Amino acid sequence: SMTLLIRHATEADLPALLAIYNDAVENTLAIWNETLVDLENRHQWLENRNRDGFPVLVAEREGQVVGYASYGPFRPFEGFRHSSELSVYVASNARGGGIGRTLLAELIEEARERKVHVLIAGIEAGNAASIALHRSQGFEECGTLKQVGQKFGRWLDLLFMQKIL
Amino acid sequence: TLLIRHATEADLPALLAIYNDAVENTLAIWNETLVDLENRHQWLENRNRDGFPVLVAEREGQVVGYASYGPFRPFEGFRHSSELSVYVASNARGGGIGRTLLAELIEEARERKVHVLIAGIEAGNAASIALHRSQGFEECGTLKQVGQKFGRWLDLLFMQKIL
Numbered sequence: 001s002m003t004l005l006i007r008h009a010t011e012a013d014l015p016a017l018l019a020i021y022n023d024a025v026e027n028t029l030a031i032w033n034e035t036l037v038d039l040e041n042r043h044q045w046l047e048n049r050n051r052d053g054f055p056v057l058v059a060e061r062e063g064q065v066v067g068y069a070s071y072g073p074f075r076p077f078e079g080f081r082h083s084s085e086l087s088v089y090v091a092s093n094a095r096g097g098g099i100g101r102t103l104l105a106e107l108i109e110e111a112r113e114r115k116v117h118v119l120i121a122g123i124e125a126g127n128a129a130s131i132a133l134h135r136s137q138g139f140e141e142c143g144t145l146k147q148v149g150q151k152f153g154r155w156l157d158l159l160f161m162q163k164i165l
Numbered sequence: 166t167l168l169i170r171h172a173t174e175a176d177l178p179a180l181l182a183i184y185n186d187a188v189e190n191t192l193a194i195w196n197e198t199l200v201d202l203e204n205r206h207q208w209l210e211n212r213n214r215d216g217f218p219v220l221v222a223e224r225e226g227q228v229v230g231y232a233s234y235g236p237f238r239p240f241e242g243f244r245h246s247s248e249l250s251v252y253v254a255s256n257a258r259g260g261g262i263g264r265t266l267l268a269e270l271i272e273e274a275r276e277r278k279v280h281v282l283i284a285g286i287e288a289g290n291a292a293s294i295a296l297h298r299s300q301g302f303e304e305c306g307t308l309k310q311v312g313q314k315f316g317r318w319l320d321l322l323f324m325q326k327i328l
């Protein structure tokens with residue numbers, strides 16, 4: 001069965017989450033640094049998420065985690081406390097099949113429940129999948145910061161999208 | 166005669182008072198809680214260790230404003246991008262202090278090989294927006310209702326200048 005179970009992340013999910021995360025760093029422009037992490041790193045990340053009351057959702061298919069989404073602080077200090085910047089990652093062999101849409105729709109509902117006012121996505125301008133994903137859930141384009149990032153001697157642009165809850 | 170120079174430890178009390186005045190009273194900084202001197206001490210020390218300038222404008226021997234920049238975002242991908250702030254003392258407003266600080270800070274940024282400067286401005290602040298525009302900043306876009314202060318929502322406009 002391809003049907004997904006959507007639920008909160010447990011420590012048992014960490015190896016899956018680690019592999020999805022490291023693959024996204026190394027192979028995509030989803031994260032603008034090249035830093036690979038380890039299991040202990042993600043363990044701390046998860047603990048700090050739970051402690052801070054930020055959710056981490058996973059999509060599970062045939063017993064295997066095939067994607068996850070979370071959000072955290074957009075910018076430091078009180079002024080921005082009701083704005084959160086989100087993350088979503090689908091396993092590299094499972095993309096284009098609606099897992100992303102499912103995870104984002106649910107994360108949006110969690111954020112509403114937890115009184116988030118604005119969800120923010122910072123997206124590389126050429127990330128067509130992410131742009132389509134967010135547009136499908138009612139995110140609107142705010143604008144683009146040109147050449148603010150860099151890969152491999154190549155300047156990247158950052159598009160912001162937002163959804164007021 | 167405004168003198169523009171690098172900040173010292175001696176300047177921290179004046180820097181603290183201008184920073185806390187903005188926090189306490191205006192929409193220019195979206196923190197609510199004031200900071201202490203040790204906090205500004207650590208801030209300045211990290212600025213200097215990281216090679217990010219802190220410039221002060223001095224007139225008749227007193228600090229009447231300052232400007233600095235720092236990381237726009239944490240990811241090393243953004244290392245060549247810096248977000249800047251310019252602060253003028255409220256009793257010293259309207260005399261070219263903002264324009265002069267911003268101009269020298271731009272020179273310091275090129276000198277240090279910054280690629281892009283970013284300003285995050287409260288979107289209704291037409292004066293701050295004009296000031297940045299007059300030095301070649303272009304509007305990127307507005308994040309609506311992303312801030313809150315004093316019981317109201319605030320919109321953040323990003324402007325940029327590629328150096």
Ligand SMILES: CC(=O)SCCNC(=O)CCNC(=O)[C@H](O)C(C)(C)COP(=O)(O)OP(=O)(O)OC[C@H]1O[C@@H](n2cnc3c(N)ncnc32)[C@H](O)[C@@H]1OP(=O)(O)O
Pocket residue numbers: 024028029030086087088089090091094095096097098099100101102121122123124127128129130132133136
């Ligand atoms: C929020 C940020 O910080 S941006 C970073 C986002 N995350 C990443 O980039 C990590 C790497 N990529 C991924 O993990 C995934 O590609 C995601 C999360 C972006 C999308 O998840 P998926 O499960 O592939 O998305 P899903 O199948 O639900 O499709 C989402 C939309 O993107 C479109 N799409 C999916 N993949 C692609 C692609 N490779 N090229 C073009 N369009 C695509 C779909 O057609 C769909 O559009 P529609 O709603 O208009 O029909």
Ligand SMILES: [Ca+2]
Pocket residue numbers: 038040041
């Ligand atoms: Ca380790």
Ligand SMILES: [Ca+2]
Pocket residue numbers: 109110113
């Ligand atoms: Ca719910």
Ligand SMILES: [Ca+2]
Pocket residue numbers: 189
């Ligand atoms: Ca007060």
Ligand SMILES: [Ca+2]
Pocket residue numbers: 193249250284285286287
């Ligand atoms: Ca600002």
Ligand SMILES: [Cl-]
Pocket residue numbers: 074075237238
């Ligand atoms: Cl940001």
